[PDB]
Amino acid sequence: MVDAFLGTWKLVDSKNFDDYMKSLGVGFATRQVASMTKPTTIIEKNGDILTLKTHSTFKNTEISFKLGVEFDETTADDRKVKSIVTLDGGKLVHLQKWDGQETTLVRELIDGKLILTLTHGTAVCTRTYEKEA
Numbered sequence: 001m002v003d004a005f006l007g008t009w010k011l012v013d014s015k016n017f018d019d020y021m022k023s024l025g026v027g028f029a030t031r032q033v034a035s036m037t038k039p040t041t042i043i044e045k046n047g048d049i050l051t052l053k054t055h056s057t058f059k060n061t062e063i064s065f066k067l068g069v070e071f072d073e074t075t076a077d078d079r080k081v082k083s084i085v086t087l088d089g090g091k092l093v094h095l096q097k098w099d100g101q102e103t104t105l106v107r108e109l110i111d112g113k114l115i116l117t118l119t120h121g122t123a124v125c126t127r128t129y130e131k132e133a
């Protein structure tokens, strides 16, 4: 069940996002702006289709997908990837593949907060969000 992930989420803490972006080859100026931007994640459901929006003053993205079914995605940093999102241990696990590389975006609810763990190479970033009323 994906339902406790649904809603509007505001970033309240970030650890090692620069390391994660740098590992992906993101340029210094984008990392600089990204490091001070407050993003919002919106997750909504219509039947088996999830839509995940990222809104900010800098980058904005939107994806729609069915759990367990691969989809094409063009990321905020312009990578063209093959993606799949699955529930695993109650976590929303998003795997992206491109050029033989992989990165995971794992979302877990802890005490009503959404904890996003981003891993690429050796870099591990933890971004925490709080629900908007």
Ligand SMILES: O=S(=O)(O)c1cccc2cccc(Nc3ccccc3)c12
Binding pocket: 021, 024, 026, 030, 033, 034, 035, 037, 038, 039, 054, 055, 056, 058, 059, 060, 061, 075, 076, 077
């Ligand atoms: O969407 S994210 O998943 O964070 C994202 C994931 C992976 C790489 C990213 C690189 C630059 C900016 C992002 N987003 C961003 C969006 C709004 C504000 C600041 C950064 C990246």
